[PDB]
Design a protein around this ligand. Structure first.
Ligand SMILES: CCCCCCCCCCCCCCCCC[C@H](O)OC[C@@H](COP(=O)([O-])OCC[N+](C)(C)C)O[C@@H](O)CCCCCCCCCCCCCCC
Lengths: 10, 238
């Protein structure tokens, strides 16, 4: 559940 | 005058304003659902989207891209509100109108509208930000000082709150040197512009803290699948 972490790894 | 290499790198990383606007507007103009009341829902998504562009900008940033995601998350966790505020403030400086405010969408809001529609916290925060706008205009804040201040804010966390101290601590030192050297070379008859700009960051942080309070008082709900990045940032802990 980390939108932020999702973005940073994309 | 000569311009610090770090600043020139930062200018190459600056997004094109109209592309940023077009993307944000395209998201905002999507057939909407029915939970908070207008205009808040729209403006909230706007801020959310602006932060998304900011995150994208940080992913292209020289030292930031290097760091482990844990640290990236922590830097952004510390600075998101200040970056948004500085973005808004700088938008107003370029815009140059005391009677209204310019939003990232190109949309313009009358200060007289805010006076009637806005709660006291929101109203006093917007007016407080206009004051800082007037100060920075008078100080002749330019684009080079701007991108450098963004960079400083991004890396404004005491390194002890991070895992890796080394890379971030150096970055802090380089950016501070670049701002000093640039203000000295390009604004020699200002005298302490460097200090005055760092002092501005104190007020940015204060505005940023009041902005979070306003949002806290909205009592926003957690999301089923999370949809709003800023909501996550707001509820995120230490
Ligand atoms: C977190 C960092 C953010 C910093 C700035 C980010 C950049 C974007 C925001 C720019 C400024 C938006 C101002 C536009 C206001 C429109 C006119 C009128 O005032 O609208 C009504 C009002 C809602 O009523 P209320 O005061 O909440 O209760 C009123 C009372 N009643 C509850 C009884 C009904 O305004 C809101 O809907 C605006 C929603 C803004 C969404 C982004 C929130 C970020 C932080 C707060 C605002 C910061 C202001 C800028 C200064 C830094």
């Amino acid at each position: 559940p980390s939108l932020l972490k999702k973005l940073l790894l994309a | 005058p000569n311009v610090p290499e770090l600043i020139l790198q930062l200018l190459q990383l600056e997004p094109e304003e109209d592309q940023v606007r077009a993307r944000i507007v395209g998201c905002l103009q999507e057939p909407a659902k029915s939970d908070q009341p207008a205009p808040f829902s729209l403006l909230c998504r706007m801020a959310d989207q602006t932060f998304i562009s900011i995150v994208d900008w940080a992913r292209r940033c020289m030292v930031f891209k290097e760091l482990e995601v844990a640290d990236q998350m922590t830097l952004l966790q510390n600075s998101w509100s200040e970056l948004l505020v500085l973005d808004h403030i700088y938008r107003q400086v370029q815009y140059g109108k005391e009677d209204s405010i310019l939003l990232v969408t190109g949309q313009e809001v009358e200060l007289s509208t805010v006076a009637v529609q806005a709660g006291s916290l929101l109203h006093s925060l917007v007016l407080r930000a206009q004051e800082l706008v007037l100060q920075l205009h008078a100080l002749q804040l330019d684009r080079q000082e701007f991108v450098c201040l963004k960079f400083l804010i991004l890396f404004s966390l005491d390194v002890k709150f991070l895992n890796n101290h080394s890379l971030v601590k150096d970055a802090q030192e380089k950016a501070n040197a670049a701002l000093l050297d640039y203000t000295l070379s390009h604004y020699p008859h200002s005298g302490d512009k460097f200090q005055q700009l760092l002092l501005s960051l104190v007020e940015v942080r204060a505005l940023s803290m009041q902005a979070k309070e306003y949002l806290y008082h909205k009592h926003l709900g957690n999301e089923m699948p999370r949809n709003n990045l800023l909501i996550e940032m707001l509820q995120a802990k230490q």
